[model samples]
Target: GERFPADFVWGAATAAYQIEGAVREDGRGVSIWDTFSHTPGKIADGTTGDVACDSYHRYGEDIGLLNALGMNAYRFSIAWPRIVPLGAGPINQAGLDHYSRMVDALLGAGLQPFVTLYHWDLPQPLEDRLGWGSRATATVFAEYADIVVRQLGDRVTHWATLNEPWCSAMLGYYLGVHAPGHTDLKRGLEASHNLLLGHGLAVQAMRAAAPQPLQIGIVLNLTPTYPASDSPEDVAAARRFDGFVNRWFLDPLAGRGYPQDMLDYYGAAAPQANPEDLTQIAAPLDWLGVNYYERMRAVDAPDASLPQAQRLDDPDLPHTADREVYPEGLYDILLRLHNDYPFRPLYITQNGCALHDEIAEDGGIHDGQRQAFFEAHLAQLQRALAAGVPLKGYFAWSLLDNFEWAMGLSMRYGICYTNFETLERRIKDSGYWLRDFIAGQ
Candidate 1:
């Protein structure tokens, strides 16, 4: 079905730490990522984002690429440390000027700017001061949000408070794979609460500071959970996995509070939220940004201690290096959100697969798998739209091949291939496919 509305946003997503290099310039302070990527044995490729893609200095060229792709919207994150060098200190005019130029550039190229306030690049000072585990971080984050909105709110109309707090909590604190890595479930739960608290407060701050009516939202990475079988135990395991990954954050935003089942499961590891915190966290949002990649198939695992559900990988299914290829899961998840959740307008803020793309003899990347991945997912998205899901837009996971966190530069998820050595950008076949798709629309 050709149901994408003419007003629908066609864009690409990017994170500051992932694409913007020159981490030491423009009054930028050190972030947890800067620290984590530098730590030995932490990054898979043993490389830091100190000079990633160098988008900080080459954004003009990147914006040109966006225009060439016929994109109408560009979703990018602002580094918190860039604005408040120490996380809770004086404003850096240089940093503000930098993003201001970026916004102007986007508008000049006839693109809407969807600005994400935070994207897991917390300042090192915040980590030194107990990080997201402490509620203090939420308070400081709101102040930082106010500062950023006041500066760029005049030009930017769309704002997202945080990009995937689950990754910030679970992957960073529980699995010990992301920045400020810590392997403690208790700490992860606490950090999760504080991150949501921060989102709510930041929403209020941006609302108050915006010169015009702005669309404010939060981006969550949600994975649909499917039971391995119809057995009661497997169903329960699937429910638990959903509660842990999707509901843990969704319930709070929808004013449902945290899932009681998860709370009961956690017991002592549960996050202690202030009585008023939930109210702020449930503050009305204009939209919800969902970043979906793959689905999780869970089976009952009595032997497993934590989460109690073992995620199973099907050996017979096709995969993209790390994730399974299941585009139908996209439709299922969107329908689930529409049927179960209160959030209205939705956006596929990030959706793309990483492939080992190589430059061909013809000086072009032929990422056929990546192209097929987008085609299938977008078809599912159109199905959801036809089914009455109020999805507003879709943004590809990334616009450029930049530094992937923890995995470092080992994985490439970009539509435009980047030469790590020369920092040159070349649009891949998938990128051109998207360009033509958008043109046809």
Candidate 2:
């Protein structure tokens, strides 16, 4: 891949619940993760994020680690629990003060801080109140955004509304793998819709609270829809899967309202909503974020039901959740994102993989597979940008190994390896490789 522009945001990313572990710190209230992961049988390993990365107490330490990597950007989410304290607020002064300090630290390091507002650590209070089951939360989120930007938006240049709402809606609501787990697709649709509306409201709110030049966007995980084979059934299955996963949430944010097939499905399954819901849902955006991992060779299972079109599961024949690994899927998604809505710019916000990582006795972690993953994805992205995809920036999945959601710390996606027991930090070979990749010298 060719060298990126000097100002391109070459960085690593992480989420609040996945990293920040001062569970009950500085006016931070209990988040949905606290309640959900703590429930018996909810988390895979029964491991809670009680001390995930100890980041709340040691972010400065992590900042120092990023500095050593020679990165100019650091993408992290402000713990919503820390900021909002109770979903809506009288303003958590401690929360404001904490982010204020982080922004200052980032500035001090000569690195720009890219803040993601929501990374699945929903304020538990919101879940108690219709849980994205109502539009009221969107308004609450707008007010929350105003408060966040008012405090730290000056020092932070990029503000992301949410991290992978697809995972939030589909996994959390439909599959019940993530927090606030439920298996209802209709509620999943409602959650997906409200997430975007909240994004729009948050973006608008940030406008007033932001400093002169600010970038606001939403992060979405997208995969290329690949048919299992050239068979007509496979192709049709791919189309349906695309509508189910990718277009379901994207069409609304890009202002096309909802995809018609999806809307028809929703109409047949869920409650009626006022016309105002659709109008508010179609909030315009300044940019889009694409989090690509792999492609899905989908073949329909009609038994998959109404709210969701098909019973599509990973083909179990050598794939991750979707039965495929086409690095070109990265390029394909960027192309589709533009085709779906040509009005806004897109960011390759997250592109990384997690294979088995081995720690050597000589104090090293190879992760060559992870390096190859980066090379393939980057090569595809470089091609897409050359073909004119307004692709502004790219952030690898993570900066370090931390609590990996329900998987706990089993799946490693970090550039830096953390010995969870000692909390000792060691830069992996891939981390060094990344330093070289970003430098290109």
Q: Pick the candidate with the highest TM-score.
A: 1
Give the Cα lDDT of each candidate: 0.93, 0.78
Off by over 4 Å in 2: 270-275, 305-324
Candidate 2 per-residue C-alpha lDDT over 1-441 given as tens digits, one digit per residue, 9 for 90 to 100: 486777787788888888877889778898888888898988767777888778877889889878888888888988878877888766788888988988899899988888889888888898898667678888988888888888786677788888888888778887888888988888887888788778877887888777666878788887677776677877777777787778877777656767787667567444354566667655566677787877776665666653223434454533322124468878888877766575467777777777666688887998787777778778888898887888877888788888888888776778888777777778888788888888883
Position 347, candidate 2: lDDT: 75
TM-score of each: 0.98, 0.93
Per-residue C-alpha lDDT of model 1 across residues 1-441, encoded as one tens digit per residue: 765899999999999999999999979999999999999999999878999989999999889899999999999999998999899889998999999999999999999999999999999999999899889999999999999999899899889999999999999888889989999999999999999999999998888888888899999999999999999999999999999899999999999989999999999899777669999999999999999999999999989857889988988779997789999999999999999998979999999999989999999999999999999999998999988999999999889998999888889999999998999999999999999999999
Q: Say what the RMSD of model 1 is.
A: 1.0
What local lDDT score does residue 198 receive in model 1, on the 0 to 100 scale? 96
The whole-model C-alpha lDDT of candidate 2 against the native structure comes to: 0.78
